[PDB]
Symmetry: C2
Subunit: 213 residues, 2 copies
């Protein structure tokens, strides 16, 4: 028989941070939908001018309502354009993670804690999503990746391994690899029990002693 997409996929967020290339946003939507993910958040885009986008929109933290993604993005999304139309555009990674319980930063050994592969981290993400918790995968700038404050806002380090002597994986290929891994694991059996983990907003409150007893 044929398996339906698990509902828990609706709880997985793809988060793109400080994106330069409008095309990459389009690719990301295309990669996501193909692997059954529909929830995209764009955080502080700094879109460069391209052959297809002479005039990149400029992002305004005070007036997010004005922000319109370039035609180029929509073009590259194809039949995944809906995903872009439903994207949350947001000014801080904090706001984007507000209600998530797990958030993986994609980085490389540019240095300190243990990195985990998508193979190893996806099970934990899937169970969490299955429990009704929002979970997120966070991607940084094409050139710069995630700043160290961005990385610190996440509670998991994710790496994609490969050839130690040569490694060249662009952001679209990285989003593709991660969405593939996620989907590749949806044949896992899931226990339906009774959970509550704290969200990122709640964790911020507690660290700042802003909780109310």
């Amino acid at each position: 028989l044929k398996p339906a997409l698990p509902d828990y996929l609706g709880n997985i967020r793809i988060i793109l941070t400080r994106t330069s290339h409008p095309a990459n946003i389009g690719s990301a939507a295309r990669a996501m939908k193909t692997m059954g993910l529909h929830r995209l958040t764009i955080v502080t885009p700094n879109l460069m001018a391209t052959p297809m986008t002479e005039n990149p929109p400029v992002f305004n933290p005070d007036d997010v309502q004005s922000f319109a993604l370039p035609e180029e993005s929509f073009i590259l999304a194809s039949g995944a354009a809906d995903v872009l139309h439903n994207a949350e555009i947001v000014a801080t990674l904090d706001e984007a993670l507000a209600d998530t319980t797990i958030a993986c930063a994609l980085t490389s050994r540019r240095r300190t804690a243990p990195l985990q592969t998508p193979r190893d981290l996806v099970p934990e993400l899937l169970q969490a999503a299955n429990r009704g918790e929002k979970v997120a995968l966070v991607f940084g700038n094409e050139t710069f990746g995630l700043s160290i404050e961005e990385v610190r806002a996440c509670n998991r380090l994710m790496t994609i391994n490969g050839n130690p002597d040569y490694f060249s994986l662009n952001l679209a290929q990285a989003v593709q690899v991660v969405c593939y891994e996620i989907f590749s694991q949806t044949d896992s059996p899931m226990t339906h029990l009774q959970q509550h983990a704290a969200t990122h907003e709640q964790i911020k409150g507690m660290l700042a002693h802003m909780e109310s007893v």
Copy 2:
């Protein structure tokens, strides 16, 4: 500690068949090397004219020696250009598979036997390569995929699953996904024993009753 690339990777071949876009050859090399694969075979390329390749080379089955890949391919390969320089260019999928023992056709349900995922097929490929056997992953034309005679030349059907309602994975992303899967499994323990499986050339001989007793 840090793991070296397994030598058995040297026995895995990526085979690209009836490729239209010169860029895709470049992408494939880049995707491969990043995941520690170095062996590319190009079979009957039919390169289309692009903005960067006004004059695609025309492939001649009788004079393979003349065939030079466009600059565009080399450009897109980056620091994986060596892989393209070491590519075997060949006229038939038969010649390309001649000395392999396993060969996976990448296709979709355009119809009859069971398809296997890269997750499920890679173990078998890795053990085989580990035994010293050559093994191959076969990719068809961007528009047309593998002809039915091509598929029949392979002894495994490989599919990449995703969203049943929308699936859009280009050839570069497909090569990327497959190389990732391969590498993602190189942490598997391998038994060193004493093997012999028949190669594809040998299997052709036997079916045609051309063996010598």
